[PDB]
Design a protein around this ligand. Structure first.
Ligand SMILES: [Cs+]
Lengths: 310, 310, 310, 310, 310
């Protein structure tokens, strides 16, 4: 029973994030518990203050006509319970629910551990024979308690795109809004657990430049390369099959090389010290002691600059 | 209360993929959130435009007769909420839901990491005493936003088989449609993480052709073979117990050999250099330095050509 | 409101497997989506063809009395939606649902990778004051599309035990039917991934019969025994804590021995070649080169014959 | 509308385990599908046999007053469908459902692989203004088909504590019953897969007493210690963070020592055979050859006796 | 239909924890099954004891006006079934449900294995045109059976913050309460499984101070460093990406160093014993034998004191 209008009836939205949780890097989703505030003029139940009752009349959903506000990027029918409905005298309705659905927003892992993110929540609404334009009321949209959680994420700002996008979707126009949740990752536990440990094994790898033994120079360069896959695999896991290249996937792969040419040098400091030419053997080996850490620290400024500095 | 017809009543379908997610290679399933558009002539509620009401009359499901459209390959009762029902004057009904069920479509892992896929969605409908033929309305079937996701898959096209298949199923005919979702895998993160790393270990394996020491030539060919199972097992995992052979399962298994005859050669460059015949030892070893990488690169052209080039 | 009979009313069943999926070796269960066809004479709503309506009258469940057909071995209340109900004039009712529950049938892993299986679906039905005997109508039981899936299983036949079993269960008799799904495993991906790889490591183990060095004869027999646990554990995982012995659990355990006596021989070819008696050392070692592969190939004909050939 | 009594109305319970499955050692829970039989005198619907109808009158739940029987230790609202309700003439009611909820019973892993267990199911019932005492009818409680499953567990007996416990819970007394399911584990697959394999690696560890080489005596004692953590971790996984000590957690930890002092001995048979005193070296080493296996077999009788024999 | 008051109507709450389970360190959530007791004066259904019926009248939810009590930090619409409603004569209502939702309370992993926790449950309630203040009745809040579980946690006390917090949330004030569950972790299974094993490998690492061989001094310091990542990774797993530093993450990382300088020393006891200056080699090596275990035991007093002792 939609509200007999004279033009496209505006509906006024608003979201108060109560809870934020379980951002799932692999699935690229997150759950959110929050308020959903709607409002519109339904002159059809304007109601004479003095003549009867009181300031505002409480209705049940079945009584009033209510605009079907569906979320766009959600796995399931959103999970809301209605909190209150209050009809002003002019025929203005005040709606409030408290939904909790899991949202499907994509993430950009280009700078993986040192990445910032922009999540999205949507709210389309399809028309009937009066058009429906949605729009935000920023007193109900300042939504985000001083308690929002999001484990392992710093939260930067909950804002929203005032101007909606009105679509042509199947002989009926809908109107879609963009609620933006901006976050930065708490990279850190990434260092004592992944970055640093990954680095130390790399250095011991090439302790084998200050050694003559092949027997102990494979037990060296090789034993570490194993340990590196332990880190490659640990990381390749809490992260999706990105069609692009990650920052960490970069240096985690750049590393694979300094083990290959490390295992190259130790191999050649042998078919060139068994060929009785240690003239050249402890010449190469001596150089590698600089070649490597420098090409590295250089390739990391080269790699690093390539990702953040552009 | 089915619509008194004069022939097999056509029902007009259509699916608008809103979301696609969680393609599960192991289970061979995927979840999809999408619209379901139906329509048919139910002359029984044709309704005199001028005489009453308006252009089109909105009903509730309980009011109208509605065709039971069940999905064929689905784990559970599909999870749909009804979006709108609009009855045209001629007795034509316009239905729209927004379901989200997980689909059971099989996948072909013959070219695993470099494989393209064809997923299926079904929609049977059983008859009563008027027959039901289903069919597609391609304005409601262009379904697939410019936002469909499918992590780690490039999506090629959402089309559908115009001509249905009408079955004889238990003294009542049903009519079944084929909605096709075509995708190609984003192989790539397969290289820096599986292909390349798997290769590197294979090369170091056979650095042991340029060495005399057995002590460091097992610490060599053996230490890597371990690391290979790390990749055999990493892969054997995100992939089902196929009754056929995978491309990667092939070369991952072809590899097992070049470690066996690699461990053969180093073993024989010993009971043939302890038998004081290093005449032959550093003859064999010298050859293997070519035999191997060539038999390989040859066996990979032989293997590769065998899978894609036919 | 049960159908006033003169004897135990027969109810006629039938199952049309639409989908089969997710057979879970560890949990010993499987999910199935299928039709459930029932029928019985309820003379109480026989209904005068000519006098009124039409050939057959469509009812809703609430209208008719319906026999509660519960599945026996199922995790949960089975998940069915009703497809159609049609009452013949003689008072004969025609019922069809389309359930999908996960079944708890046990499996026999005695021949694990080369095992064939027999799954079960049950359907009891408890009596009131007329007795209920169930029985099958084989036109509705030929159920199993030419599309049944069951990843990694070849499917042999869907049949069912015509004669039911009528129990005495709590002062009321029930009647239970046996629907049989026969399957064979697609062993194969078991070879290039488990059998073969497990074998190769075993052979390299005992490359250490053609070697003098203990240093490289432990880096040999020992380095492989590790890799074997990688396969013992990979297999011990996708398989339940069976109270009996598996075929693969057998040879996977028979193997553990040929590494123990292999590590025995290499150990004794040392406290018997450091005791300056290489007379005996390269005597034993020379024998083991045959002893082993033969005792093995013999113990596998002995083991193999013991499991399949009896 | 509760049955106007003259004293605390007794309700007569009973559980017929139809299915048992998925005992989850880590979570300490299990799922059960079973009957639930209740009965009580509600003289308020006693009903004159001859005067009307028949022997017993079938009602729907909404008709009769029914005692709310909630399970105590359950994750969720239990999942029951009602099977039949039959009211005797004296006003005696006969109820039967067929629930299936997952039960939260704790387990005692003190003897882990060789442990027996006692599971629990509960059924409280809160009072109104007539008191409710629950109690069991052992014809409906002999519940447990000759088909109960419980993968990897032998099932010993389904009994129940006749005498209930009546609580004072919030100004209303409740009455709680104890249904006991006793089981023993099928330890076995624990041997060829965990115990035995764990033992063999331990023996090879200390093959290094019959060797002089340190190079091959670390490749020995160390290479196995790795393989042991593979078993420590395999086991530490299918088992909860117990605040006590397991039998297997014991010997799996007692083992860690015989590797430490094994790695001690081989280390000292070196800074005491480089120090030109092989007088003492191949003295110690010679002893360890007995010291170890004996201290062990002794420590296992000491450990074993400590756990089962007390 | 809210109770016509003269001031802000107080509602009296209370929670009786029946079950506690599945505290999920990674997700920072826990499930709880419990009673929810509410009460308030609704003089509007005060009801003349003598004049009619009895002491207290039982209603159904639809009958009475009931305050919507929503939980704040919960994933979903809380999962409650209503247990009883009893209206006193003065118009006082007595409500009791038995909900079971999973709660989103944050945890502080600063002292990870030796950490104590404070969980939260919330209950807001939004106002209409009478204000609602919530408050606790400590006879119904002594809630926590003598059976509360919480695997791997010792439970210290269930209390609650008497004084509520009344918000200004969207032109309507709400009232929120704080129910506190205090717990301590059962660290312990952390020792025989993580702390101790992690330590032992560290000690063997530096058995290489009493050795001359580089070949066996890498097979030493290196083979252990691998095993350490096995523990770094085992722990980094059952623990969230904390933006701060854990105690165990500390010493697990402090450890990475004593392997680096350990692998430093063994490397330098070589380019300084091949440079014929074993004067200095077995001088350094001799010192490290003390330097290390002391700097460590000192750095652990330094680290330890830094975390708990402040
Ligand atoms: Cs080695």
């Amino acid at each position: 029973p939609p509200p007999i209008a004279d033009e496209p009836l505006t509906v006024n939205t608003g979201i108060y994030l109560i809870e934020c949780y379980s951002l799932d890097d692999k699935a690229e989703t997150f759950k959110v518990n929050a308020f959903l505030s709607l409002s519109w003029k339904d002159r059809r139940l304007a109601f004479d203050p003095v003549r009867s009752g009181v300031r505002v009349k409480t209705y049940e959903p079945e009584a009033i006509w209510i605009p079907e506000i569906r979320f766009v990027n959600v796995e399931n029918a959103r999970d809301a319970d209605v909190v209150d409905i209050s009809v002003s005298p002019d025929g203005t309705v005040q709606y409030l629910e408290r939904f909790s659905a899991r949202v499907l927003s994509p993430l950009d892992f280009r700078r993986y551990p040192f990445d910032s993110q922009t999540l999205h929540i949507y709210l389309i609404v399809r028309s009937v024979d009066t058009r429906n334009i949605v729009l935000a009321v920023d007193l109900e949209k300042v939504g985000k308690n001083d308690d929002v959680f999001l484990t392992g994420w710093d939260i930067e700002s909950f804002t929203a795109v005032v101007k909606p996008a009105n679509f042509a979707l199947e002989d009926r126009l809908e109107s879609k809004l963009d609620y933006q949740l901006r976050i930065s990752r708490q990279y850190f536990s990434y260092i004592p657990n992944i970055i640093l440990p990954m680095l130390f094994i790399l250095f011991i790898s090439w302790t084998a430049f200050w050694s003559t033994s092949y027997e102990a120079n494979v037990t060296l360069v090789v034993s570490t390369l194993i340990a590196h896959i332990a880190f490659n695999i640990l990381v390749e896991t809490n992260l999706p099959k990105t069609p692009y290249m990650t920052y960490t996937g970069a240096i985690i792969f750049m590393i694979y090389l300094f083990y290959f040419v490390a295992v190259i040098e130790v191999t050649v400091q042998h078919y060139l010290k068994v060929e009785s030419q240690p003239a050249r053997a402890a010449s190469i080996t001596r150089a590698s002691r600089i070649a490597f850490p420098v090409v590295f620290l250089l390739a990391n400024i080269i790699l690093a600059f390539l990702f953040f500095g552009f």
